[PDB]
Amino acid sequence: NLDNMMDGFYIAPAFMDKLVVHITKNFLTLPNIKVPLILGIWGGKGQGKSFQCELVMAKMGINPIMMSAGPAKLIRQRYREAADLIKKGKMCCLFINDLTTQYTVNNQMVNATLMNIADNKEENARVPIICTGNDFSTLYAPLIRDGRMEKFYWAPTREDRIGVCKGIFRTDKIKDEDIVTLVDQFPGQSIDFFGALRARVYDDEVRKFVESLGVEKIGKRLVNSREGPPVFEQPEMTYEKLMEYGNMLVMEQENVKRVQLAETYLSQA
Length: 269
Known about the structure:
The structure is a monomer. This protein is α/β, with parallel strands linked by helices. The chain folds into two domains: 156 residues, 3-Layer(aba) Sandwich (Rossmann fold); 113 residues, Helicase, Ruva Protein, domain 3 (Orthogonal Bundle), CATH 1.10.8.1070. 50% of the residues lie in helices and 9% in strands. It has ten helices and seven strands. The strands form two sheets. It has a five-stranded parallel beta sheet, with helices on both faces. It has a two-stranded antiparallel ribbon with strand order 1-2. β1 and β2 form a beta hairpin. α6 runs parallel beside α8, α7 packs parallel to α10 and α8 crosses α10. The longest helix is centred in the C-terminal third of the chain and has 24 residues. The protein is globular.
């Protein structure tokens, strides 16, 4: 089973299974089973990871105490904030986006050893910790062999990419058959590329609206009206338009690379 959709956005079944089971195991009393407190999700940037995490946690009705970079005493602060949401009978977990990093490893290690009592007097709630990153340094291996941290490698399949995109363009004109074709036309592109693609079409349509109205008339039409910020009408999103936008972003990706490579031919001055 497992219902893999939240607000029209698709969740990868295997991503969801690992995460839900992790959280569930952490909120049950098992016989003599070493339950990892931490779950490390890794793969190349731009894929689902943090976004998928947010959708699973939402589906379950969880408001997670989140962080990124962004001393190491803040981890204990956010941890206890989550442990307090549990005390008030509201399932919560600690979610750390994108992984000086020397103390955090220890801070995580001290929590993993004594999670029911983490201070910085009464004894607190156990909080599952969910971490997203790129490769996860050999720095994290002591938790891995102990069984305090479980490592999960996740890379989206063609169906995950298609699933996610249908959710991204759910509110838009486009047919699903066209969304599949667009995904197939850019197989070297991560999921955030399709999000960047949609964002640029909107950014261009707002420019057409601004150019057609005029700089001087924007203020009065947008803010003066006794109630609410106006709803912007969705642009006509054909396959060909999305395709031109897509190809344009690839050019921008390539030109940045070309420029960096071309600079090697000129002396440092």
